[PDB]
Design an enzyme around this catalytic site. Structure first.
Site, PDB file in Angstrom:
ATOM      1  N   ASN B  43      52.263  40.366  23.705  1.00  0.00           N
ATOM      2  CA  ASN B  43      52.509  41.676  24.356  1.00  0.00           C
ATOM      3  C   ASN B  43      52.432  41.527  25.854  1.00  0.00           C
ATOM      4  N   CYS B  44      51.421  40.779  26.291  1.00  0.00           N
ATOM      5  CA  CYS B  44      51.069  40.656  27.695  1.00  0.00           C
ATOM      6  C   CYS B  44      52.117  39.880  28.482  1.00  0.00           C
ATOM      7  N   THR B 274      34.085  53.409  10.925  1.00  0.00           N
ATOM      8  CA  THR B 274      34.508  54.793  11.095  1.00  0.00           C
ATOM      9  C   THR B 274      33.505  55.715  10.387  1.00  0.00           C
ATOM     10  N   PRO B 277      32.500  54.713   5.283  1.00  0.00           N
ATOM     11  CA  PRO B 277      31.788  53.429   5.228  1.00  0.00           C
ATOM     12  C   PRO B 277      32.626  52.206   4.831  1.00  0.00           C
ATOM     13  N   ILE B 279      35.993  51.912   5.811  1.00  0.00           N
ATOM     14  CA  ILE B 279      37.060  51.812   6.792  1.00  0.00           C
ATOM     15  C   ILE B 279      36.469  51.470   8.154  1.00  0.00           C
ATOM     16  N   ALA B 281      37.493  50.041  12.333  1.00  0.00           N
ATOM     17  CA  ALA B 281      38.559  50.141  13.318  1.00  0.00           C
ATOM     18  C   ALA B 281      38.197  49.451  14.635  1.00  0.00           C
ATOM     19  N   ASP B 284      42.737  48.964  20.900  1.00  0.00           N
ATOM     20  CA  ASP B 284      43.074  50.095  21.794  1.00  0.00           C
ATOM     21  C   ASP B 284      42.840  51.453  21.149  1.00  0.00           C
ATOM     22  N   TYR B 428      30.391  23.900  44.667  1.00  0.00           N
ATOM     23  CA  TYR B 428      30.816  23.760  46.045  1.00  0.00           C
ATOM     24  C   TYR B 428      31.258  22.349  46.411  1.00  0.00           C
ATOM     25  N   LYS B 436      27.797  28.918  50.781  1.00  0.00           N
ATOM     26  CA  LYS B 436      27.520  30.191  50.155  1.00  0.00           C
ATOM     27  C   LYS B 436      28.871  30.762  49.695  1.00  0.00           C
TER      28      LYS B 436
HETATM   29  C1  LIG Z   1      53.543  45.168  28.494  1.00  0.00           C
HETATM   30  C2  LIG Z   1      52.062  45.064  28.203  1.00  0.00           C
HETATM   31  C3  LIG Z   1      51.292  44.178  28.962  1.00  0.00           C
HETATM   32  C4  LIG Z   1      49.926  44.051  28.731  1.00  0.00           C
HETATM   33  N1  LIG Z   1      49.205  43.170  29.475  1.00  0.00           N
HETATM   34  C5  LIG Z   1      47.869  43.012  29.290  1.00  0.00           C
HETATM   35  C6  LIG Z   1      47.146  42.108  30.075  1.00  0.00           C
HETATM   36  O1  LIG Z   1      47.742  41.435  30.953  1.00  0.00           O
HETATM   37  N2  LIG Z   1      45.808  41.973  29.876  1.00  0.00           N
HETATM   38  C7  LIG Z   1      45.177  42.688  28.900  1.00  0.00           C
HETATM   39  O2  LIG Z   1      43.946  42.553  28.699  1.00  0.00           O
HETATM   40  N3  LIG Z   1      45.865  43.568  28.133  1.00  0.00           N
HETATM   41  C8  LIG Z   1      47.195  43.744  28.309  1.00  0.00           C
HETATM   42  N4  LIG Z   1      47.916  44.656  27.497  1.00  0.00           N
HETATM   43  C9  LIG Z   1      47.195  45.429  26.462  1.00  0.00           C
HETATM   44  C10 LIG Z   1      47.032  44.620  25.179  1.00  0.00           C
HETATM   45  O3  LIG Z   1      48.333  44.307  24.643  1.00  0.00           O
HETATM   46  C11 LIG Z   1      46.233  45.442  24.158  1.00  0.00           C
HETATM   47  O4  LIG Z   1      44.948  45.797  24.701  1.00  0.00           O
HETATM   48  C12 LIG Z   1      45.994  44.714  22.843  1.00  0.00           C
HETATM   49  O5  LIG Z   1      47.260  44.281  22.334  1.00  0.00           O
HETATM   50  C13 LIG Z   1      45.319  45.672  21.856  1.00  0.00           C
HETATM   51  O6  LIG Z   1      45.221  45.103  20.547  1.00  0.00           O
HETATM   52  P1  LIG Z   1      45.414  46.028  19.231  1.00  0.00           P
HETATM   53  O7  LIG Z   1      45.327  45.089  18.066  1.00  0.00           O
HETATM   54  O8  LIG Z   1      44.542  47.254  19.335  1.00  0.00           O
HETATM   55  O9  LIG Z   1      46.914  46.562  19.378  1.00  0.00           O
HETATM   56  P2  LIG Z   1      48.309  45.745  19.325  1.00  0.00           P
HETATM   57  O10 LIG Z   1      48.129  44.318  19.794  1.00  0.00           O
HETATM   58  O11 LIG Z   1      49.270  46.669  19.994  1.00  0.00           O
HETATM   59  O12 LIG Z   1      48.645  45.666  17.760  1.00  0.00           O
HETATM   60  C14 LIG Z   1      48.810  46.888  17.053  1.00  0.00           C
HETATM   61  C15 LIG Z   1      49.866  46.600  16.011  1.00  0.00           C
HETATM   62  O13 LIG Z   1      49.657  47.469  14.910  1.00  0.00           O
HETATM   63  C16 LIG Z   1      50.923  47.939  14.458  1.00  0.00           C
HETATM   64  N5  LIG Z   1      50.802  49.236  13.750  1.00  0.00           N
HETATM   65  C17 LIG Z   1      50.458  50.426  14.273  1.00  0.00           C
HETATM   66  N6  LIG Z   1      50.477  51.343  13.282  1.00  0.00           N
HETATM   67  C18 LIG Z   1      50.844  50.718  12.136  1.00  0.00           C
HETATM   68  C19 LIG Z   1      51.031  51.138  10.813  1.00  0.00           C
HETATM   69  N7  LIG Z   1      50.836  52.440  10.480  1.00  0.00           N
HETATM   70  N8  LIG Z   1      51.400  50.227   9.871  1.00  0.00           N
HETATM   71  C20 LIG Z   1      51.599  48.939  10.202  1.00  0.00           C
HETATM   72  N9  LIG Z   1      51.425  48.509  11.470  1.00  0.00           N
HETATM   73  C21 LIG Z   1      51.051  49.384  12.443  1.00  0.00           C
HETATM   74  C22 LIG Z   1      51.779  48.034  15.701  1.00  0.00           C
HETATM   75  O14 LIG Z   1      53.147  47.838  15.353  1.00  0.00           O
HETATM   76  C23 LIG Z   1      51.258  46.885  16.541  1.00  0.00           C
HETATM   77  O15 LIG Z   1      52.031  45.710  16.299  1.00  0.00           O
HETATM   78  C24 LIG Z   1      49.309  44.801  27.719  1.00  0.00           C
HETATM   79  C25 LIG Z   1      50.080  45.691  26.961  1.00  0.00           C
HETATM   80  C26 LIG Z   1      51.448  45.828  27.202  1.00  0.00           C
HETATM   81  C27 LIG Z   1      52.229  46.796  26.347  1.00  0.00           C
HETATM   82  C1  LIG Z   2      30.340  12.586  53.048  1.00  0.00           C
HETATM   83  C2  LIG Z   2      29.479  13.660  52.407  1.00  0.00           C
HETATM   84  C3  LIG Z   2      30.107  14.614  51.584  1.00  0.00           C
HETATM   85  C4  LIG Z   2      29.359  15.616  50.969  1.00  0.00           C
HETATM   86  N1  LIG Z   2      29.979  16.544  50.186  1.00  0.00           N
HETATM   87  C5  LIG Z   2      29.288  17.530  49.578  1.00  0.00           C
HETATM   88  C6  LIG Z   2      29.937  18.475  48.771  1.00  0.00           C
HETATM   89  O1  LIG Z   2      31.186  18.440  48.586  1.00  0.00           O
HETATM   90  N2  LIG Z   2      29.188  19.444  48.190  1.00  0.00           N
HETATM   91  C7  LIG Z   2      27.848  19.503  48.365  1.00  0.00           C
HETATM   92  O2  LIG Z   2      27.184  20.391  47.804  1.00  0.00           O
HETATM   93  N3  LIG Z   2      27.192  18.599  49.123  1.00  0.00           N
HETATM   94  C8  LIG Z   2      27.894  17.621  49.738  1.00  0.00           C
HETATM   95  N4  LIG Z   2      27.215  16.689  50.559  1.00  0.00           N
HETATM   96  C9  LIG Z   2      25.760  16.787  50.710  1.00  0.00           C
HETATM   97  C10 LIG Z   2      25.381  17.803  51.783  1.00  0.00           C
HETATM   98  O3  LIG Z   2      25.976  17.421  53.028  1.00  0.00           O
HETATM   99  C11 LIG Z   2      23.856  17.846  51.916  1.00  0.00           C
HETATM  100  O4  LIG Z   2      23.296  18.259  50.679  1.00  0.00           O
HETATM  101  C12 LIG Z   2      23.343  18.859  52.934  1.00  0.00           C
HETATM  102  O5  LIG Z   2      23.946  18.599  54.199  1.00  0.00           O
HETATM  103  C13 LIG Z   2      21.827  18.697  53.040  1.00  0.00           C
HETATM  104  O6  LIG Z   2      21.281  19.552  54.020  1.00  0.00           O
HETATM  105  P1  LIG Z   2      20.045  19.102  54.951  1.00  0.00           P
HETATM  106  O7  LIG Z   2      19.781  20.204  55.958  1.00  0.00           O
HETATM  107  O8  LIG Z   2      18.929  18.669  54.067  1.00  0.00           O
HETATM  108  O9  LIG Z   2      20.475  17.735  55.671  1.00  0.00           O
HETATM  109  P2  LIG Z   2      21.645  17.434  56.719  1.00  0.00           P
HETATM  110  O10 LIG Z   2      22.760  18.419  56.540  1.00  0.00           O
HETATM  111  O11 LIG Z   2      21.913  15.956  56.605  1.00  0.00           O
HETATM  112  O12 LIG Z   2      20.977  17.763  58.148  1.00  0.00           O
HETATM  113  C14 LIG Z   2      19.826  17.041  58.558  1.00  0.00           C
HETATM  114  C15 LIG Z   2      19.893  16.798  60.051  1.00  0.00           C
HETATM  115  O13 LIG Z   2      18.590  16.498  60.538  1.00  0.00           O
HETATM  116  C16 LIG Z   2      18.708  15.515  61.566  1.00  0.00           C
HETATM  117  N5  LIG Z   2      17.450  14.749  61.697  1.00  0.00           N
HETATM  118  C17 LIG Z   2      16.908  13.940  60.762  1.00  0.00           C
HETATM  119  N6  LIG Z   2      15.746  13.432  61.253  1.00  0.00           N
HETATM  120  C18 LIG Z   2      15.580  13.940  62.493  1.00  0.00           C
HETATM  121  C19 LIG Z   2      14.603  13.788  63.472  1.00  0.00           C
HETATM  122  N7  LIG Z   2      13.526  12.988  63.274  1.00  0.00           N
HETATM  123  N8  LIG Z   2      14.734  14.465  64.627  1.00  0.00           N
HETATM  124  C20 LIG Z   2      15.772  15.266  64.858  1.00  0.00           C
HETATM  125  N9  LIG Z   2      16.721  15.423  63.930  1.00  0.00           N
HETATM  126  C21 LIG Z   2      16.656  14.766  62.755  1.00  0.00           C
HETATM  127  C22 LIG Z   2      19.877  14.641  61.150  1.00  0.00           C
HETATM  128  O14 LIG Z   2      20.538  14.062  62.290  1.00  0.00           O
HETATM  129  C23 LIG Z   2      20.779  15.605  60.401  1.00  0.00           C
HETATM  130  O15 LIG Z   2      21.815  16.091  61.259  1.00  0.00           O
HETATM  131  C24 LIG Z   2      27.971  15.667  51.179  1.00  0.00           C
HETATM  132  C25 LIG Z   2      27.346  14.715  51.986  1.00  0.00           C
HETATM  133  C26 LIG Z   2      28.093  13.718  52.599  1.00  0.00           C
HETATM  134  C27 LIG Z   2      27.340  12.718  53.450  1.00  0.00           C
END
Ligand SMILES: Cc1cc2nc3c(=O)[nH]c(=O)nc-3n(C[C@H](O)[C@H](O)[C@H](O)COP(=O)(O)OP(=O)(O)OC[C@H]3O[C@@H](n4cnc5c(N)ncnc54)[C@H](O)[C@@H]3O)c2cc1C
Ligand SMILES: Cc1cc2nc3c(=O)[nH]c(=O)nc-3n(C[C@H](O)[C@H](O)[C@H](O)COP(=O)(O)OP(=O)(O)OC[C@H]3O[C@@H](n4cnc5c(N)ncnc54)[C@H](O)[C@@H]3O)c2cc1C
Ligand SMILES: CC(C)(COP(=O)(O)OP(=O)(O)OC[C@H]1O[C@@H](n2cnc3c(N)ncnc32)[C@H](O)[C@@H]1OP(=O)(O)O)[C@@H](O)C(=O)NCCC(=O)NCCS
Ligand SMILES: CC(C)(COP(=O)(O)OP(=O)(O)OC[C@H]1O[C@@H](n2cnc3c(N)ncnc32)[C@H](O)[C@@H]1OP(=O)(O)O)[C@@H](O)C(=O)NCCC(=O)NCCS
Ligand SMILES: Nc1ncnc2c1ncn2[C@@H]1O[C@H](COP(=O)(O)OP(=O)(O)O)[C@@H](O)[C@H]1O
Lengths: 555, 554
Positions: B43-44, B274, B277, B279, B281, B284, B428, B436
């Site tokens: 549907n979606c 419903t 007891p 039935i 449901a 939607d 991160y 952060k």
């Molecule tokens: C164009 C569109 C885009 C959507 N996009 C999203 C989305 O991006 N993200 C999201 O979370 N939701 C989306 N939805 C909503 C999502 O489709 C519905 O929340 C979900 O399908 C609900 O499930 P359901 O089983 O209650 O109903 P449905 O999946 O509609 O199924 C109900 C079925 O029961 C059948 N039925 C009804 N009465 C009878 C009967 N008396 N006898 C036999 N069969 C019957 C119907 O023919 C239908 O096929 C979208 C809906 C539409 C129409």
């Molecule tokens: C190449 C690299 C890639 C990384 N990538 C990631 C990542 O993708 N994700 C992630 O979560 N972590 C990553 N890290 C780890 C992350 O950088 C450290 O966890 C984080 O910086 C630690 O914080 P800190 O304040 O303890 O130390 P630091 O950031 O190292 O700061 C400590 C500072 O104190 C100073 N210092 C030390 N002693 C003295 C002193 N006696 N006097 C004065 N100054 C001093 C140093 O010069 C240094 O600048 C990476 C580290 C490296 C090296």
């Protein structure tokens, strides 16, 4: 509140974040920030991308300038200034002006240590003689590496250490047109992830023409670093070396002042970031933290924690303690060429080390609805307690939508949600963004089925031994899928035919099911269990198996 | 033991409940009854197929009748319309859509997921409007696409600017069709607030959509080709899309004497039962309680319908019943280059319920600004000042919007407050976020209000305040004054302000604005500490100028 004189050591992630909020809490405090380098609040994380030429403007690496920040927050900011000694009973620090060589003592009421962590430099023979060997921490390091590339035109580079930073350096060197070899002593890149997840990453790196050397280290550097002799005896000829083998806390100031140290030489702090001295606080890479999941003392050097800690510390100093640091979850993410790789909480390797019983599931699901263009697979590994549903950790990889899924799961973990709650996260769904059940919901359903006992499973590393021991393995894929390969000892019964071919299923053997991804194997498992068969599904199916154990694939 | 379960409706709720029911029990006889030709269609995806984005018609069919019936041993009956529930006999009456022949089918348990149908207004001349279409199913989609192919419409009119109307605007526009959107309200997209809609309107105007607000169709003339509006304006058009909402398909329930809820929804309890007891449901068609305030409402979305179906299967044949805690109403739409997302309640609803709230608007980058291609993410957070309870959030921007909304929607369902948002440790690295995250940032902004570190005023308050004695300081750098200012503003750049304190009157209430609000907050902190009565203008000039562009002063 009464005004105090607050001195901050380190001017980057921890130091800058605490100084700015401290000023927002008080106009009267004297706030001094002492930084040994030339720059405060530089983008450490951006350094590899500047080297790679992805960040084209060096100036974009300066998040704040000294001039701007001192004026905005009325901060006494002292760059090129090294704190060389803390005198805790005197309540002064000794500072060296690196430019002028003048040294002086600075009195404090509160001292805050955020000195970070320094690269580990190994004692490799010939390392002193290595002309083109580089570590990466700061802006001068970056300038130096970039200058060498631009001027000496290296054609090949060797990266030692495959952590998140070594890997990012691998990518950025390739980006410059440099051939790259990565040397790792472990059997995988990226310690935070488990072996089978790293298997995918290795594939993507090798597809971008990176040579991966595992279970090897540098034994010696010869020819002024142009020859890298590996422990095994193999040799790499290279034009430059990047060392990225981890970091160690900058705790020498604390050690020198007789402050208590935590695990791996970190600075030890209490719940309020207080050191063993009441007037000295510490945050960032240099401190010991508890991990959120197990509350085990560890060291997790990430930027979000450093910023969060600095920010919270400012509040704490001002007596706002209603919220204290909950520990570090360890949520991390890296770009690896076309892949995003993320992790949070604990992996299998750590949980085994801690003797914690867990279960895992691997669920591959599309980034968004398959009927909408450019959907791509996201693989989620979820690690959890079978009994409580407590989430120990998660890992995710894929080309798109990976960061989103990690963030939701990481959010759920910190909110103390269990795997049974994940299926109930009402997430954003429209065709370009997700599916009616998001990948997060999906991994939650899979994990919930194990918690609830609807399915029993075995792992990729278990299945072969199970088959050798008499396990009956049924492959429920369609026959054409088997051309991709199969697990040894497999017998093919297509899922859609299975209900019609039950007579072919032995009731005297333990049944094991695999498909491609695990989903159809699970459906088959459910069916067979309801028919009274003892059955287990192979988690991740053949796709996972074949990625991690390609040499065992039968064709 | 074994049960005969009959499911009415074969799409979102119906296919979801049916498949899980089978996984729970091989013994049950499961019959699924659908009036249309297809089950589990996308549907979606319908609007994107019309727009030529989804090129394969066949992709709109998620699972075929034959494949699903085989996989889950389901008796699936398409082109079968349930005409009547016989609740005393525990039978339903089914009519063959092709032949009009009927038969009865007994049930042990009956599950209604009939969905919702488009609202058709009584417009004079609507019966003659050959090129007027609504969009619900595949046949509707085929008819619309066929019309476009056969008649090559130069211009289309979309009536109703909700999430679906807007998507239709986009997909028609990108086909090279000129589009006029006609909306009764003063904004598109009712789930979002007026000032957030202002961003959507500007973007839609930039893609050459003609937007018509506070208007409606009084008459359709010349067989729909002439649209007579209530304002007097006349639109010449080649086709019309009517997207003014959906109403629950509850006639089966109404006809069986089942309790109904708001807007004619099927009333159900916490287990989807419903007033009968046997039935149940979902979808939607049912009344839900909103998650935030537990008010009876109707939120027709696919995540809920899919979730309700899986849960209901578990209630019937699974383990410990989880109860439905209501619908949060997390939604998202693509609007050209924008993503627009919402969750929980907006100001309009909160005001209607007389619930006291505060709001913050925090614009932050999708990822670190020192890394290439960062783009703004605007997050509006609505909350209780005393408790920090989150009432709702809205977000928009070009990238990283679905991520921020999903995190916030997760926090709300996990019962986190605005005070917990700063402590969310998210992923991160430079390409993905900042030290952060935007979510952390909006958390910090809201927390400062809860904790009393800053007091604020809104875009819709500042002019009146200035008229009535407010002293407004613009703390932007002079360069940032390029797109104008709020009337009565006096520029004292933040970085100069501490030096120019003598220029701030001490006997007046001070108001501060910057570009996005962050530096105005820093100024406000400073002035509060120096003893001034000060408030920050939430969202700064960028928000103000977006929503009230005619009031901008140069
Ligand atoms: C164009 C569109 C885009 C959507 N996009 C999203 C989305 O991006 N993200 C999201 O979370 N939701 C989306 N939805 C909503 C999502 O489709 C519905 O929340 C979900 O399908 C609900 O499930 P359901 O089983 O209650 O109903 P449905 O999946 O509609 O199924 C109900 C079925 O029961 C059948 N039925 C009804 N009465 C009878 C009967 N008396 N006898 C036999 N069969 C019957 C119907 O023919 C239908 O096929 C979208 C809906 C539409 C129409
Ligand atoms: C190449 C690299 C890639 C990384 N990538 C990631 C990542 O993708 N994700 C992630 O979560 N972590 C990553 N890290 C780890 C992350 O950088 C450290 O966890 C984080 O910086 C630690 O914080 P800190 O304040 O303890 O130390 P630091 O950031 O190292 O700061 C400590 C500072 O104190 C100073 N210092 C030390 N002693 C003295 C002193 N006696 N006097 C004065 N100054 C001093 C140093 O010069 C240094 O600048 C990476 C580290 C490296 C090296
Ligand atoms: C930039 C840096 C100095 C922090 O300084 P800061 O003044 O706290 O700046 P931030 O952007 O973090 O500002 C957040 C504050 O503004 C507020 N804010 C943000 N946008 C707002 C808006 N639109 N309206 C109102 N308030 C807003 C937040 O509430 C928060 O206030 P609080 O901390 O008083 O509660 C520091 O994070 C830094 O140096 N970073 C780079 C170094 C680094 O992190 N390195 C690791 C490797 S990348
Ligand atoms: C798809 C549809 C037929 C439901 O069928 P379904 O069999 O539940 O399919 P899903 O993919 O939703 O369910 C996957 C199942 O496999 C499990 N699973 C998925 N991947 C798995 C894996 N790798 N390993 C183990 N189990 C896995 C899930 O846990 C779930 O089982 P459970 O519910 O028993 O826990 C139905 O939702 C539908 O018609 N959808 C499209 C219509 C729609 O949503 N319309 C609204 C507008 S788009
Ligand atoms: N008579 C009318 N003329 C123009 N617009 C209308 C009329 N009645 C309702 N609308 C608008 O139509 C939109 C429908 O939104 P929504 O409820 O999401 O419908 P849908 O689910 O079909 O998109 C609302 O913005 C509403 O204000």
């Amino acid at each position: 509140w009464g005004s105090r004189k607050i001195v901050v050591v380190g001017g980057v992630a921890g130091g800058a974040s605490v100084a700015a909020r401290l000023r927002r809490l008080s106009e009267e405090d004297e706030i001094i920030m002492v930084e040994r380098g030339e720059y405060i609040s530089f983008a450490n994380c951006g350094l590899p991308y500047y080297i790679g030429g992805v960040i084209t403007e060096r100036q974009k690496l300066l998040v704040q300038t000294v001039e701007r920040m001192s004026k905005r927050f009325n901060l006494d900011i002292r760059v090129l200034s090294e704190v060389v000694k803390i005198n805790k009973e005197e309540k002064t620090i000794t500072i060296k002006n690196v430019t002028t060589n003048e040294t002086y003592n600075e009195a404090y009421d509160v001292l805050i240590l955020s000195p970070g962590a320094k690269p580990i430099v190994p004692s490799i023979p010939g390392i002193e003689e290595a002309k083109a060997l580089f570590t990466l921490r700061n802006v001068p390091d970056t300038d130096r590496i970039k200058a060498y590339i631009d001027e000496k035109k290296p054609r090949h580079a060797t990266v030692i250490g495959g952590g998140f930073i070594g890997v990012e350096m691998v990518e950025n060197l390739r980006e410059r047109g440099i051939e790259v070899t990565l040397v790792e002593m472990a059997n995988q890149v990226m310690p935070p992830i488990d072996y089978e997840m790293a298997a995918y990453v290795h594939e993507h790196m090798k597809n971008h023409d990176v040579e991966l050397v595992f279970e090897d280290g540098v034994d010696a550097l010869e020819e002024n670093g142009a020859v890298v002799r590996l422990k095994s005896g193999s040799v790499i000829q290279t034009d430059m070396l990047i060392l990225a083998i981890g970091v160690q806390p900058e705790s020498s100031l604390a050690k020198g002042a007789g402050l208590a140290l935590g695990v791996r030489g970190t600075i030890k702090v209490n719940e309020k970031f207080q050191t063993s001295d009441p007037h000295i606080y510490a945050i960032g890479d240099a401190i010991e933290v508890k991990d959120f999941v197990t509350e085990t003392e560890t060291m997790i050097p990430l930027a979000w924690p450093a910023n969060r800690q600095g920010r919270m510390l400012a509040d704490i100093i001002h007596g706002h303690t209603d919220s204290l640091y909950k520990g570090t979850l360890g949520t991390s993410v890296a770009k690896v060429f076309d892949l995003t790789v993320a992790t949070t909480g604990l992996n299998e390797k750590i949980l085994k080390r801690l003797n914690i019983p867990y279960e895992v599931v691997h669920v591959q699901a599309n980034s968004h609805a398959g009927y909408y263009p450019n959907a791509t697979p996201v693989l989620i590994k979820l690690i959890f307690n079978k009994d409580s549903g407590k989430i120990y950790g998660a890992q995710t990889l894929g080309r798109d939508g990976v960061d989103k899924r990690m963030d939701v799961i990481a959010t759920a973990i910190k909110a103390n949600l269990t795997v049974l709650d994940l299926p109930d996260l009402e997430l954003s769904y429209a065709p370009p963004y997700s599916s009616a059940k998001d990948p997060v919901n999906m991994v939650g359903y899979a994990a919930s089925n194990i918690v609830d006992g609807f399915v029993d499973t075995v792992q990729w590393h278990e299945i072969d031994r199970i088959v050798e021991n008499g396990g009956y393995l049924i492959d429920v894929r369609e026959p054409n899928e088997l051309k991709q390969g199969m697990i040894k000892g497999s017998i093919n019964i297509p899922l859609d035919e299975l209900r019609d071919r039950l007579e072919e299923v032995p009731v005297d053997k333990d049944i094991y099911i695999t498909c491609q991804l695990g989903m159809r194997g699970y459906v088959a498992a459910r069916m067979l269990m309801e028919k009274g068969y003892k059955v287990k599904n192979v988690d991740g199916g053949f796709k996972l198996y074949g990625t991690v154990l390609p040499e065992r694939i039968v064709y």
